[PDB]
Structure formats: C-alpha cells, structure tokens
Ligand binder design. Sequence first.
Ligand SMILES: [Zn+2]
Lengths: 76, 217
Amino acid sequence: MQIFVKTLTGKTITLEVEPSDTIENVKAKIQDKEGIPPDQQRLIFAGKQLEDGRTLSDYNIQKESTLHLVLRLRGG
Amino acid sequence: EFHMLDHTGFAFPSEVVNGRRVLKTTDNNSWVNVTCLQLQFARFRFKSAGLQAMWESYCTGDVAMFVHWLYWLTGVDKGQPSDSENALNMLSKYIVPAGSVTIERVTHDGCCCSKRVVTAPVVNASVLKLGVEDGLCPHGLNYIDKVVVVKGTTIVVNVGKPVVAPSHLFLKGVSYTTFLDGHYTVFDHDTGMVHDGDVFVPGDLNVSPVTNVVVSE
Ligand SMILES: [Zn+2]
C-alpha cells in the first residue's frame, strides 16, 4: 500500500509498504529516497515517535497515512 | 544488564541553580542536562520504583546511575552529543501520565476537521499556537495540526526543526528547550533566564530556537 512522508524540506514523498513492514524497513525506504541515514531519522505519527522492532500495523498506520520525518540533533 | 554496569564514568559534577539540578557542560552532555531539566520542570515521576529512586538520587546530586541509564536506554556512548527530543520520546513509556493535550486537525475553510486527545507524558506536536501543516485531506486540502487544550502537565516536542518566533506565538509553558548550531539550553519562563550547563545567564525567547516545551494547565 501507499503511505506519505513529510520530508525535512516540507515536500511529501510516497512509500510502497505493507502493514507488517518494520519501522527499520520504512526508514530504509526514506534513506533510498531522501539520503537520510536510518539512525538520523525520527518518524512521528499521531503525536507518537515510532519505535524500531515494531511494525506500521502496531500503530494502526493505514494507506494514505502521512508520517513526519524529524532529523536527529547532535547537542553537546 | 544495566545493574551489572560501571556507572562511575557518568558521575558528572552537578549543582542546584534556581532550585533545579543541572550538570556542568562537559563530554558533550548538554542533551542530558536539558532532558533532565524538562523532567524537573514537568514534575514527572517514573512508573518503576527502581527508576524513580535513580531519578530522586539524580535530583539530590547522586547523578551517575540515572545519567548512565539515559545513555544506556538511548544507545549513546559517553562523550557523544545526542538529541534531547529523542531521549524524552524514549523516556515517555517509563513516565506516569500526568496530563493530556487535544490536537485539532482542520482546514482554514473547514473542508475536513477532527480533534484527538493524547495522554502520553511526551506528545509530538507544533510548539506554536497556530500549529504546523501535516498531510492532504481526501477532498484535496492540506491539514493544520495544533494543540488547543492542555490538561495537567505534558512535554510538547516540536514536529520539525528548532523554531525561532516571537515568544507570544509559542504554546504557553513554564520552560523551553532551545538548540543553537550544537548546544542545548532551557529558557525558564518565570525568571526569563536561561539554564546553560550549571550557570543562569540572561536570554531572549524571541531568538531561542525552541525544540520542546513543558505545558501545564
Ligand atoms: Zn477534506
């Protein structure tokens, strides 16, 4: 199915995913399209940060869902 | 296994500044300092008695075990800089919920509209009263997501880059984590002063790039 990701520049990309795809797998797909390394990605859906090891189905992410990408900050 | 591990390396020199436990800026630990500051500003407690004891110890100046646990939970190595908003999101499920936020998802003309109540200690939403744009509706217009109700104490974490804005445009809060690039600090609303490591310097919210806010009804 198709979901939508709001990128760092505010533009919307389409991902091809299944309900059983892991957040790691979704991050790998954003990496292919945006060049953002998975360990630098934070994905927000319905005010929640999505966790690695869980799947899109666990958060009830259905087709035409929009995820929010937020780049990891390095604060020292 | 966390309890087996040496914590002595994480015993960062700390102080009390305006009644708040704060760490001396060393070993790229500003992310630890502002994470822990917002936990105090929000007055959050942990579900686990073992975690809550580690937290109480941190606040009374025995910091090593709770600081180590933060590094350990987040997968960060001593001396590496990191992300307070990530740390706070990973901390959320360990914290006893003490409030709620209602998020309105609407179009300017009202083509499509909804409200949902979120009851997590850490909620990811715009730190601006006016909200952020977030995805297209079936009818074919872009949705605005904004916080419109605050019950108890939640930490709102911005969905986006640090936000620079005239202070009146931010959600009303007691404390504002700011990021300069990087280096984290906390704007104290009450005093209008800034927690920067273990010192209290003057600051201006209007030029502070805000990443998260403690909101309280
Ligand atoms: Zn619509």
